[PDB]
């Protein structure tokens, strides 16, 4: 009848897409990169330890100047740190103790936060006198805020645990666009270098590529076997890396529209919470649930080093725009800056 | 480098005030206890709130100590992600309507949810205070010919009331037997893999006025004492 035909058509389309993807699999990255000299061994030491948070930290974000950074903890605090001198530039108390994400504006005049209140709060840091106060409260999501990234000082893209993403205009306070299509909570998002596209990973073992202007999904990637927690673009914007609860990382290309490389090992049976790239994209840094961080050769898929200085879950990880240092946060309420 | 010295000094006395304020706030943070109120709409979860928008706040004072209760609302029924945010609360209050023993199977769903919460890897240290609401409705349904307990729990007919059971006066053995069977269903899961790091505290509540906050206070005191006794290789 009317039903049971759409399902068969969808299955046929899935088979056609799979065949088209298979027809493009000329070779593999490992075969091509056989002549590449190995990276070797990466030995990083903790250059700074930042203390002052009372509860576990979920989020951090570097500044464009590669010197200041914001961190969010469920003690009810956003702390803005100077990395070079380990001082404290700002301390902002939050109306809701439950915060899951934080962002830092590229200009540096604003920060953003959100969590188990379905509201994104924007904080102005360049007031003429007084202190930091809420300038905008974007509301309308029906689920907890998972991630938020700034586009200029008037636009922001947020992901929510209501299976939808949103693009908001800050001045009016109304969301310009809604991105639908995921069947699970959207856990992370990453902006392209040109800020024209972005990618999101959901709790359905899938990732999607969205165009900001049109508001529609262009490509979908399904290689993982469990929930996706982290996602990050390659420096040139033609690829991206994802991490999940199945304990593997995967590199997906956009032109080829399929997976290129997998980063996993037999002795790792814990999920991956954070993903980041190096300045040149040669090293891929991943935070794990076993209280450790790993460094992978992004072209040869062999582990190159371990960041082992945290006593609890590693929740957030970030690399500066200069590429000099890597900052990691954990559930033990300390930040660590490595070089 | 005079300007550099001046700005560095300004940074130092800007950090000093922030650190002083953080030291002041640390005492307030350490001196209050966070409770996670869970359950379902059918199970009540609001009459508890009555006698003390994505989350709701409640605050109450017991013997001059602070308690904060967190009601999770306006959230989807996928709790496998946002539950991890409540892994350092002192207690999870789990409210279950034991009268609805006849989705149409509330007790089995509650048992499965309790098992999932108990066996979570990030909730291995969190204790649960179990409230079994609507006992009068359960008594009325058991006394009347509404439904049979062993239609969903066939092992009930082989259950004998434990000797330690102390029912409230003016009762019938059937309602006591049903209540203790339901309670032991949760106690089995609690005792299967507790390993001494956390416990479960089951209570029977019908209409008690301001006694629920007293029960929560006593159970939190017990939780803290047991944690202190365990860390000293003494319990």
């Amino acid at each position, epitope marked *: 009848s009317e039903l049971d035909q759409l399902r068969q058509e969808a299955e046929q389309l899935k088979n056609q897409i799979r065949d088209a993807r298979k027809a493009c699999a000329d070779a593999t990255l490992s075969q091509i990169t056989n002549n590449i000299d190995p990276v070797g061994r990466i030995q990083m030491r903790t250059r700074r330890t930042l203390r002052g948070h009372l509860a576990k930290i979920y989020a951090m974000h570097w500044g464009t100047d590669s010197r200041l950074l914001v961190s969010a903890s469920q003690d009810g605090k956003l702390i803005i740190w100077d990395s070079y001198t380990t001082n404290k530039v700002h301390a902002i108390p939050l109306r809701s103790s439950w915060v899951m994400t934080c962002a830092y504006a590229p200009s540096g005049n604003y920060v953003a936060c959100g969590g188990l209140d379905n509201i994104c709060s924007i904080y102005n840091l360049k007031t003429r006198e007084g202190n930091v106060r809420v300038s905008r409260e974007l509301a309308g999501h029906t689920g907890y805020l998972s991630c938020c990234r700034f586009l200029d000082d008037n636009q922001i893209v947020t992901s929510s645990g209501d299976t939808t993403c949103a693009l908001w205009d800050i001045e009016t306070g109304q969301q310009t666009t809604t991105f639908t299509g995921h069947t699970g909570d959207v856990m992370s998002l990453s902006l392209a270098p040109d800020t024209r596209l972005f990618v999101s990973g959901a709790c359905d073992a899938s990732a999607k590529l969205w165009d900001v202007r049109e508001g529609m999904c262009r490509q979908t990637f399904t290689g993982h076997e*469990s929930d996706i927690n982290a996602i990050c673009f390659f420096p040139n914007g033609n690829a991206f890396a994802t991490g999940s609860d199945d304990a593997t990382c995967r590199l997906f290309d956009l032109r080829a529209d399929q997976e290129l490389m997998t980063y996993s090992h037999d002795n790792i049976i814990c999920g991956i919470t954070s993903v980041s790239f190096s300045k040149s994209g040669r090293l891929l840094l991943a935070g794990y649930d076993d209280f450790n961080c790993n460094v992978w050769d992004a072209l040869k898929a062999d582990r190159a080093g371990v960041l082992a200085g945290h006593d609890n879950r590693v929740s957030c990880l970030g690399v500066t725009d200069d590429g000099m240092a890597v900052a990691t946060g954990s559930w033990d309420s300390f930040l660590k800056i490595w070089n | 480098t005079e300007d550099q010295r001046n700005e560095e000094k300004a940074q130092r006395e800007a950090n000093k005030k922030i650190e002083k304020q953080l030291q002041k706030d640390k005492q307030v943070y350490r001196a209050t206890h966070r409770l996670l109120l869970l359950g379902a709409g059918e199970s009540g979860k609001n009459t508890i709130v009555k006698q003390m928008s994505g989350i709701f706040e409640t605050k109450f004072q017991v013997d001059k100590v602070n308690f904060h209760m967190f009601d999770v609302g306006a959230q989807r029924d996928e709790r496998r992600k946002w539950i991890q945010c409540f892994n350092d609360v002192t207690a999870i209050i789990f409210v279950v309507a034991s009268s609805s023993y006849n989705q149409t199977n509330r007790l089995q769903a509650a048992l499965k949810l309790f098992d999932s919460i108990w066996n979570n890897k990030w909730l291995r240290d969190t204790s649960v205070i179990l409230f079994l609401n609507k006992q009068d409705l359960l008594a009325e349904k058991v006394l009347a010919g509404k439904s049979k307990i062993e239609d969903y729990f066939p092992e009930f007919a082989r259950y004998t009331t434990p000797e330690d059971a102390t029912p409230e006066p003016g009762e019938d053995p059937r309602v006591t037997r049903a209540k203790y069977f339901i309670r032991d269903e949760f106690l089995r899961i609690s005792t299967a893999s507790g390993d001494g790091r956390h416990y479960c505290y089951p209570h029977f509540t019908c209409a008690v006025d301001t006694e629920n906050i007293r029960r929560v206070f006593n159970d939190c005191r017990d939780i803290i004492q047991r944690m202190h006794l365990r860390q000293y290789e003494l319990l």
Partner: nanobody
Amino acid sequence: QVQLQESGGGLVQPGGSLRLSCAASGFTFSNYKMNWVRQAPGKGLEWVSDISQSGASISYTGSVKGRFTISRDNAKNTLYLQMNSLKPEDTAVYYCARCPAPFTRDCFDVTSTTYAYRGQGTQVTVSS
């Protein structure tokens, strides 16, 4: 792409038997604990049974103990449910649900209205 395809079902006289098969692809079958869930007409999802990675632990609800049986073949990546004695209250759509994550002792969201790692389901009716 994780795929769970259910088989079996149909119309069966009271007292009859049915064998339901769940073919799983796209993930490592050995590392996950599997569940059989069902939804009756005009009702919600009900957990029916579950089995662990190696089959050591098996659980049922009180309305199916003694009658229903669950098993898994890890070599062929298949989940089997055998229904020996059937009743008019067993008319429902049966789904084959999967644990959200591997190597975990818990399963949070398998009877939810929406859930990613669940199959289409098969209709089973026992009327006359």
